[PDB]
Symmetry: C4
Subunit: 251 residues, 4 copies
């Protein structure tokens, strides 16, 4: 009874460790559970709906603690699949990795919390969401694509900042006394930031003909130069996928 | 008198079934008719304009029922073009497909409705709009492009969610008591969602210097990381078109 | 004295007709003049600043009429450069083209107007702006790129429309009586259109927990599926430039 | 003691002049210092927080003056690294370049200012931010990419302007008397500009059924044709990076 043993250990370590396919289904389900916990906590932040929120949240938190403990133990057991971590010493030295210790300390802290502390619960929940990666692949990919396109990101940032400063100063000059919205340069800078991002709250906006005339040009330039970085990064990601796919199809 | 018979049957089945060219003109016209029906229903949802809207909608609904019935019958007849569905048995077994039964049940239901029920009319109208595809090609193309770029979509979603949570929490801390807009963490989360998408209703916005200072950075990051997915998918679609066009030109 | 004659005629026809380089400077200057005329008319639409607006606009309109007449006559004269239009008969038959007759009728109409009619001035000014192309190249390029990417434009439009309808209906159901903003389905549709485009006026927005909860998902999907078409078309234009540049460098 | 001399001079000139790698760390730190100075000035523009703002700003301005003077002198000394600028005459003729004279005059002016003048401080601070490039590389790259994609930028601008004019005029006609927001054509143009950019202040918006019906189409077209330029430029930048990277990898 060792062929089935090794088969199961291999498959379980592969699914729980770096997955590639349908193994993501389990990760999606556990993510959905933790997300439901987070949403219930957010609902518990209110007074009207506090009752039902805590009623569900208590049992859901117990369930997620049970699930996380079981997952951690099965991961520790299946760690013997890799040729490096073998035996008692191998599994003992496996735990020294940052993420395993993070997991064990996290479940210890949350079990202590559950057994005015909701702030700690929020912190631990967002930290668990941070833990979802477990390998920093997202950060590495983002850093690679950002470094590849550093020159254009820098030029876009430079020109956008210059346009923001110029537009804010000109509008502040043109509407110093005729509009109470722009009473200090800080207010004009806030207006420029909120308009060149196209958020447009509406709390501030030019009213004199000078301000509207100057905006009709400077906002037209600034909106594009503020949307540029997202387009650059999206095209970078798409081109990287294209090149990777063609290269992998070659070999 | 069978060469013309087969010619007409072939051409009509090709036009009514998968079209490639000017056949889309008829589809566009029928879509325009159903869209006019939908708009008239929306106008009939109001009390001031109920009279004229209903007066037009009755006859337009009758016309569209007639058109859909004629189209269904001619499609059933022309189904004999394909080598698979032939004869009485072939045409009888043709109707078992999901979309043909959907069409027949749909026109039956709408004719029954026309012969406080406007909710059913709305449901059936949006269902007809769903039926416009008839092959799920849109869904398949979207799924293919999404699967191809899954890694970058995931990284963008992860970083955007983290930025949203961090910004909302920091602003909520900075404006707990000095601004009545942010009285619960749910309100801060709503503000963050509405600002990082650049919708910017204006119902909530920071007013203290802390909130504005923290936004000036976190919204700058979050707006880009929330615009990223659309750019990624658009570039994916464009690159897919380029590769498909070059490949088809090769052969 | 015929080498200089032909040299000047060739150069002037090339600059005035399809330009390629610094010839665009003259076009830019004339565009700036007509744009100034338009802006002065817009200022004349107001009562406070009517005086100075008309004072400048009268002389500017006279100047632009003079310039347009001179340009039309010199174009007619230089039309003899092309091997097709030659001599009296050639130049007479040249005028039959749609744009030349448009220009002559336009300057006739504007000279008649200048010699409560400001509406006609606005119409003729926007028409002159339309005339700026003179070849429909913009429309042809747009049509080509749109036709190339028709399938993805259609899928994006389909999914975006479905998302808009679903989100609007769900929010209307969730906020029929608890929010006076959503009192008819037309209002909910207007809100959905204004939110999925990220315009976000703020005149309408959900207030109940149901509406906010449903928006937190449906707007996240819809904003991306509404931004998709612009990204698709921009990537199409960029890829077309890349391919054209490489092809021209090949030959 | 001349091998170390030349080694240090070479390394310092390379780091202070065109950098390529970790040399950017020093530039980032000096940028952070000047940015802190700017933010403190902006805070000093207010009356409530003037005290602490000026208290920090005085010493920070002294520190930045010291740093800039030291940097200028060390740059002048290290200029001897280049084979062109050598000796007393070489270093003397080095200063004639626009940026060196700009820097020396700038530090002279700021030292004079520090030894109701805050407007001059703002001007000199934004000018120092302008000086951050020192080579105009950002402007050259932007100009190159803009020139490469000139045709599509022009077509997008043309169609977007036409759509803006048409939509504004139609909405103004449809809401001349029933909505006080649109009382002059200038107001309608302002509304169109603020809506087609998706800024959406909310100060103006259609209320009659005509205006909403016409917007539901014209804004849908205009939003895409106004977002087009940023997407075009972003894709251009990404494709330029791809081609440059492949070409450099070739050689
Ligand atoms: C102003 C501006 C942009 N920034 C700074 C910046 C970057 C990203 C941000 F998110 C915020 C601020 C910037 C601009 C330039 C030209 C350079 N180049 C340089 O100094 O080399 C001599 C550098 C090193 C930084
Ligand atoms: C254009 C413009 C403004 N800037 C530059 C800037 C910022 C702060 C300064 F103090 C000075 C210059 C800018 C713009 C965006 C969209 C982002 N976010 C982003 O790129 O996400 C990927 C950032 C990080 C900076
Ligand atoms: C937080 C976040 C994003 N999401 C979830 C998500 C995705 C799309 C949505 F639209 C909404 C939520 C996410 C993030 C990561 C790193 C992973 N990777 C992983 O767990 O493998 C170990 C997965 C499987 C999902
Ligand atoms: C960035 C960001 C936020 N997220 C990720 C997210 C969402 C919910 C969570 F609970 C957790 C993480 C996000 C953003 C967009 C634009 C979309 N829509 C889309 O991509 O359409 C193609 C989706 C589906 C998710
Ligand atoms: C709903 C939706 C989109 N539209 C219509 C549309 C297009 C552009 C607009 F700007 C507005 C409306 C649409 C959708 C599909 C699936 C098809 N395909 C089809 O019928 O072939 C069988 C067609 C022909 C049109
Ligand atoms: C997604 C979405 C909505 N739709 C589709 C749609 C429109 C009307 C219907 F009645 C039905 C379906 C849509 C979206 C945009 C941005 C545009 N404009 C554009 O693409 O400019 C290039 C158009 C022309 C249609
Ligand atoms: C209207 C419009 C766009 N513009 C002007 C413009 C450009 C950029 C701006 F930011 C602002 C205004 C424009 C349009 C066309 C067709 C041409 N072509 C031409 O005249 O050749 C005969 C030119 C030379 C300029
Ligand atoms: C589409 C549209 C409007 N236009 C064209 C236009 C402008 C003024 C006119 F008077 C006439 C035509 C437009 C749009 C944008 C985003 C920008 N900014 C930009 O591209 O940054 C890179 C500019 C410079 C012009």
């Amino acid at each position: 009874r060792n062929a089935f043993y090794r088969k199961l250990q291999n498959f379980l370590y592969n699914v729980l460790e770096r997955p590639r396919g349908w193994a993501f289904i389990y990760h999606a389900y556990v993510f959905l559970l933790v997300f439901s916990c987070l949403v219930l906590s957010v609902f518990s932040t209110i007074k009207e709906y506090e009752k039902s929120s805590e009623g569900a949240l208590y049992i859901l938190e117990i369930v997620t603690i049970v699930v996380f403990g079981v997952e951690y133990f099965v991961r520790i057991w299946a760690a013997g699949c890799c040729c490096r971590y073998r035996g008692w010493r191998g599994r003992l030295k496996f735990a020294r990795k940052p993420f395993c210790v993070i997991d064990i300390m996290v479940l210890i802290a949350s079990i202590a919390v559950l057994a005015s502390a909701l702030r700690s619960l929020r912190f631990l929940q967002i930290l668990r969401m941070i833990r979802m990666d477990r390998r920093g692949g997202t950060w590495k990919l983002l850093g690679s694509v950002v470094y590849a396109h550093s020159k254009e990101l820098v030029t876009a940032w430079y020109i956008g900042f210059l346009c923001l400063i110029l537009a804010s100063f000109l509008v502040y000059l043109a509407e110093k006394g005729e509009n109470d919205h722009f009473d200090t340069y800080a207010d004009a800078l806030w207006w420029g930031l909120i308009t060149l991002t196209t958020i447009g709250y509406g709390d501030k906006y030019p009213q004199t003909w000078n301000g509207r005339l100057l905006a009709a040009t400077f906002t037209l330039i600034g909106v594009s130069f503020f949307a540029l970085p997202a387009g650059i990064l999206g095209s970078g990601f798409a081109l990287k996928v294209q090149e990777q796919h063609r290269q992998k199809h070659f070999e």
